[PDB]
Symmetry: C2
């Protein structure tokens, strides 16, 4: 029997184009580009013919296909984009069965407790050396597949390690004073606790809210203030900021200002309610989904690759041109790019062992009750990988992208598949190079970049990260920010109102009674680069103007001050875009005797004002707890247990357990396994163009080969010799 072609293909997620003049259907789904004419006994998949027992049937203007059409066509094998991995890569993320296995093991322990939750269940990484031997020498990793299982027992954190290969518990270690991150059920609990609160309902009523059932809460970490906030350091708490649901799908546009509840999660109750001046809730409808807008007409534009892609995805390994890397997912930080090599005329040279987002923070600068403690450590306290936002095909990624699914463990230990978790796409990026010598034939080649894109949404903000692989060896890392602004309710409608001046001291008036409170977006990337080997050194090249001592008319010259940076303490610094910072390999040189290196550029530009550091006085606790915010460049000695700029357990942390801690012993960085950390941020002063919803704003970072190669990397294969 048969099924309706359009409805089915759409369900399946494929793009369907019908050409009435050619009597042809063009279907696109990831690596598959298909053409099929009604009644034809064959279809075309990526330029190759595929026989069809049951042809597409056109009946009274509707197309119908066999119930096996989707599988016969899309899983035929003519689309070679994906290939089966034969020997499992040691860095492959835990499978669904491994996740379940790890959970059964801890649950089999005499200490496991019933309400125990899982903040993170991830692969315990094999030793770096073996992983490289597997990637470069294909040597098997004879070390048991293990898993780190971080558990939250009520409010207590416990770390356990399970031996997946032998199915047994290796360690069970409680971690004192550590608080666990915010888990999904905490959101529902806060909403429910607020809904059952008699006092809160009364506080809300005096603030002009009739139906307390329309109040939407949002859970926020309280941070640490040495008690000045009057909060017990031992309790598992969350502060709650509320908004009113007016039915326009954007409760964020209706803040109930100056009302903050403090909820104790173990106690399941509001332990404190801070109330400030009453501010009338902004009620005007401000939808961002277009319900009240006209859909403008736009002509179609598609980027197509009719014969398939230039890259191949074997299991989780991606091969594209000279690049080879492994791509996996972690529930905390998202995507992890591993064992990155660049094939230099037959030899795979190491570039990066492991790269991923280290952590990020969005701190506010308003001192009022509903804002003084507001600082979001999105990955650390919320879990960005778990909050991945499925890619909206053709909108969040170009129409020629391939969308990957990724699996991780939810907070109850059950496997979870995030659909369209990461997008992979090749794109035209202008001329790779060009030279039009006068009177001679032109010379130009196009530039191609391979992009790996991932989006994660935490509350009101959506963040986009692109890991950009340039064909010429350069690696770009861009961070985009969009979503809905966290706003403050104010009495002024315009800057001509009496309280205007005071209402906008900490932010711009972006709408009537609405202020986009100033804040920063600070991202940090953990890049374990291994420049053509493990042992590297940090080198500084500062371009300078020096007096001319060679004679002739010039008074000055352009020279460079080159010097090594021998320790972690001196490597932690601000980044001057006018200078050059290299991670060199003092053991290997290019054809000219120069050390093979990678130039590190933590600041390659951005569309919002740039954050010069943390916009906090040096005596602020957030400033003290999180030193990674104030420096753009950090370099530490490799250690398998140092992966977060903000530290492993940042919720209500009392001291820097991150980059401040990783560099405190000021170790030597001379000819050793170094790990680069790049911090780049923006200082967001709002404007009306960003409300009700903000247009994506981007920040760029870059890693460029510096004398890593001996000539223009994309000139091509040498014809003679």
């Amino acid at each position: 029997h048969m099924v309706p072609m359009d409805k089915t293909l759409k369900e399946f997620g494929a793009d369907v184009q019908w050409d009435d003049y050619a009597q042809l259907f063009t279907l696109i789904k990831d690596g598959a580009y298909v053409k099929v004419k009604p009644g034809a006994q064959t279809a075309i998949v990526n330029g190759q013919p595929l026989a069809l027992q049951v042809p597409v049937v056109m009946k009274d203007n509707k197309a119908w296909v066999s119930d096996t059409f989707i599988n016969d066509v899309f899983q035929s094998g003519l689309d070679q984009t994906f290939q089966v991995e034969k020997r499992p890569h040691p860095l492959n993320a835990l499978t669904a069965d491994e996740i379940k296995q790890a959970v059964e093991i801890v649950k089999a322990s005499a200490d496991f407790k019933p309400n125990t939750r899982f903040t993170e269940i991830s692969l315990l990484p094999p030793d770096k050396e073996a992983v490289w031997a597997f990637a470069l020498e294909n040597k098997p990793v004879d070390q048991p597949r293990k898993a780190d299982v971080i558990m939250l027992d009520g409010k207590h954190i416990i770390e356990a390690v399970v031996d997946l290969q032998n199915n047994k518990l290796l360690s069970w270690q409680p971690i004192k004073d550590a608080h666990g991150m915010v888990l999904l059920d905490d959101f529902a609990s806060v909403q429910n606790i607020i809904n059952n609160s008699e006092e809160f309902a009364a506080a809300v009523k005096k603030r002009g809210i009739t139906d307390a059932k329309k109040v939407i809460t949002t859970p926020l970490t309280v941070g640490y203030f040495d008690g000045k906030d009057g909060l017990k350091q031992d309790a598992r708490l969350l502060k709650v900021i509320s908004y009113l649901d007016v039915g326009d799908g954007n409760y964020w546009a209706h803040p109930i200002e100056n009302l903050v509840a403090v909820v104790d999660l173990e106690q399941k109750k509001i332990v404190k309610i801070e109330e400030g001046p009453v501010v009338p809730v902004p009620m005007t409808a401000r939808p961002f989904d277009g319900r009240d807008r006209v859909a403008p007409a736009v002509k179609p534009m598609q980027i197509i690759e009719p014969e398939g892609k230039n890259y191949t995805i074997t299991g989780d390994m991606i091969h594209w041109r000279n690049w080879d890397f492994h791509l996996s997912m972690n529930s905390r930080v998202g995507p992890m790019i591993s064992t990155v090599t660049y094939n230099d005329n037959g030899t795979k040279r190491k570039v990066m062992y492991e790269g991923s987002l280290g952590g990020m923070i969005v701190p506010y600068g308003d001192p009022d009750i509903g804002w003084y403690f507001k600082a979001y450590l999105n990955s650390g306290d919320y879990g960005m990988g778990t909050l991945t936002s499925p890619i909206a095909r053709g909108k969040d990624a170009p129409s020629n992208a391939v969308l990957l699914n990724e699996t991780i463990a939810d907070y109850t230990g059950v496997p979870m598949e995030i659909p369209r978790a990461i997008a992979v796409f090749e794109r035209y990026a202008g001329p790779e190079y060009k030279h039009q010598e006068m009177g001679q034939p032109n010379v130009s080649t196009e530039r191609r970049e391979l992009v790996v894109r991932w989006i994660s949404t935490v509350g009101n903000y959506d963040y986009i990260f692109d890991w950009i692989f340039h064909e010429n060896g350069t690696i770009g890392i861009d961070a985009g920010a969009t979503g809905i602004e966290a706003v403050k309710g104010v009495k002024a409608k315009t800057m001509h109102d009496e309280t205007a001046k005071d209402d906008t001291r900490y932010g711009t008036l972006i709408d009537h009674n609405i202020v986009g409170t100033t804040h920063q977006h600070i991202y940090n990337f953990r890049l374990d680069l291994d420049v053509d080997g493990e042992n590297n050194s940090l080198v500084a090249m500062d371009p300078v103007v020096k007096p001319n001592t060679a004679g002739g008319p010039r008074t000055s010259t352009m020279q460079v001050n080159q010097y090594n940076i021998g320790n972690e303490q001196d490597a932690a610094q601000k980044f001057d875009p006018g200078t050059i910072r290299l991670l060199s390999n003092p053991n290997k040189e290019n054809r000219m005797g120069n050390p093979v290196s990678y130039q590190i550029i933590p600041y390659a530009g951005g569309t919002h004002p740039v954050a010069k550091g943390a916009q906090f006085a040096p005596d602020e606790w957030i400033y003290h707890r999180l030193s990674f915010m104030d420096k753009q460049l950090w370099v530490t000695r490799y250690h398998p247990g140092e992966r977060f700029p903000e530290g492993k357990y940042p919720n209500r942390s009392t001291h820097d357990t991150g980059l401040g801690q990783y560099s405190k012993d000021n170790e030597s960085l001379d000819n050793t396994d170094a790990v680069v950390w790049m911090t780049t941020g923006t200082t967001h002063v709002a404007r009306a163009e960003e409300w009700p919803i903000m247009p994506t704003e981007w920040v760029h970072t870059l890693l460029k080969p510096w004398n890593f190669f001996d000539e223009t990397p994309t000139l091509g294969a040498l014809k003679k010799d």
Copy 2:
């Protein structure tokens, strides 16, 4: 009948045959055509077209009527280009006007026999009249006038012609001004070197056996208050030489420490400077792929089957809410004019005129063949004249529309530049997005319209992109590629004796070759008229201040806002951590905030950033080109102040550019301002950039700031 492939390719269209669907897909600029063999009709940009003669297959070759191209491509179904019945007042001089202007000056008794023309361009009506035409269709009632700058030998003369009335209005010799380098000067230099026995003897000394393989390159000499020993009244050019070894890349074979000074009027070398002898680097280093084989790549296309979202009428481009005029100039290239943003049915002013103002590539080596090296690309060589035709699909994406532009050559004869500018729309990630937990996703794609121009001067090729975002932002990016200017040195590796001295002013990027450090400094002249003529420059500096509102916080994030009242204060360094707005103090958005545009001179770059001029304050290039040391400049609008480096920068003795335009320190309060953005890079070379450099980019941005009342891309309310 006539062969399709042959005819179509000669026409410049792309031909795709699909055997499975028996369909030909033909593409050229905005025309996207589909035609099946034997079919009585074809499709042009999604619309049906009756064919007089069906396409016919003859021995597996398709044939079409001799009128096919005309009936199909010029059918009228391709609406990309529309007829302009009332010519915009900024339209560039046409070929007929150029020839007419030239005949008017030649009819004068003051015209001399071998006079050349450095520039023949339109002399535009007053700004007011042009805006009135763009916004109210009011006719500019002033005859078309042309500025005709002549070079008589070495003497510059400025004339003005009235094109309507066909008469000469003025003829004014310009005292002390030196003319820009003209194309015939290139041949004279090479020829003068060829006929120089002294020179050939110097070349022989340096190991060159065949003086006929010597390639000269002409360079302006700058000004050193006589320290260079050159006469200020003489039209001179210095010459740097290379050896042609047959690899198509003479740049890779410098003849170091040999410089000749040529007097163009005397037509002879007037001075030869000789430094240490350095063997010419000889190894073949082609950049054209003659010695290479590219890896096979699966095909990729960017299709727009229904045609483009933009329309081109004359030179007026309309796309989404934008409207602007695109014209060409021989000195600075493209001019973006009368830019308005259609805000819910009402066209609001954004920019009267924007274009590259000028640029410079100053070097940092003091030696004989480098100390005076400073390329004023547009000003001394003419970037519009040297435009490099776009290589379809490579220099610009495959869905681009390539425009042809016309200018006058140095002899006054119209010169049409094929594929002079590329226009193309491109996907640029999500316009905005919000995925509220457990709710339907909301995302829209971002589209950017790019206007791309490429200019090549000697060894460097420069790419300029004028980017219009749907949300009102305007981006201006400049890319740099080409062949690096290298110095011949004795060291082959950093392990050789002279290596350290050889690399004191640049990196050793190849054996015996050092890419001498230098900077790339661009300056954009943007006569922004934010929602009107009268604007003011406002500074917003984000700062950390002590908390005085109570609570646990010790500090707060606040803004220090203040106006910049004069030209002198407006000439400043740009801190990317601060905000700079060109605001209209007479109009406000719904929230009572002054409608403005945020000026960002530095939005990013792939090469190290130039924080200013890498020259001591007493260097002559420094004193002559003040624009190199400040990233932001704002001056009072004046019709004859268009170049950051001065109108006549060749051997200029002082700043006639931005230093002169702002010298008077005028008021910038509620008045017609002109913004100048200087953005540069400091280039310290690497091996990855030789023999040909991968394109490096810099970005600048102009963002609407409380210009609108909400997200500009949500759409009109139902």
